[PDB]
Design a protein around this ligand. Structure first.
Ligand SMILES: *C(=O)/C=C\c1ccc(O)cc1
Length: 125
């Protein structure tokens, strides 16, 4: 296990040291996105929540292909605004219901320490 708590003030700092191996040790889902919504990293906890296979969704667009239920002003709109502004830090509850049993989650989106990368963090509620 990688002891990092969900919602940690300095989470972008802590996770800049991890490779996909270490990311898989998190107590929660973590997705890394580029500015366009493309998946750069997808960890095993997220796979456990959504039933997706990590390696199969890497390189796919999250809002277009993988998760259309987040293609909405309540999710994707917050993301596109963060990317445009170059700052992002927001936490909100959401239901994931695409090709899966509807599953209520807590989502935290935050800009990574690195230029054009963005984190999506997910835990069950
Ligand atoms: C809604 O679009 C629910 C599905 C879903 C699939 C994968 C990930 O990572 C998040 C949400």
């Amino acid at each position: 296990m990688e002891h990092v708590a969900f919602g940690s003030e300095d989470i972008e700092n802590t996770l800049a040291k991890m490779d996909d191996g270490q990311l898989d040790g998190l107590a929660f889902g973590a997705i890394q996105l580029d500015g366009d919504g493309n998946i750069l990293q997808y960890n095993a906890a997220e796979g456990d929540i959504t039933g997706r296979d990590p390696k199969q969704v890497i390189g796919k667009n999250f809002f277009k292909d993988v998760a259309p239920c987040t293609d909405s002003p309540e999710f994707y709109g917050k993301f596109k605004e963060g990317v445009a502004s170059g700052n992002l830090n927001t936490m909100f509850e959401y239901t994931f219901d695409y090709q899966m049993t509807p599953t209520k989650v807590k989502v935290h989106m935050k800009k990574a320490l690195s230029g054009d990368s963005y984190w999506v963090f997910v835990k069950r509620v």
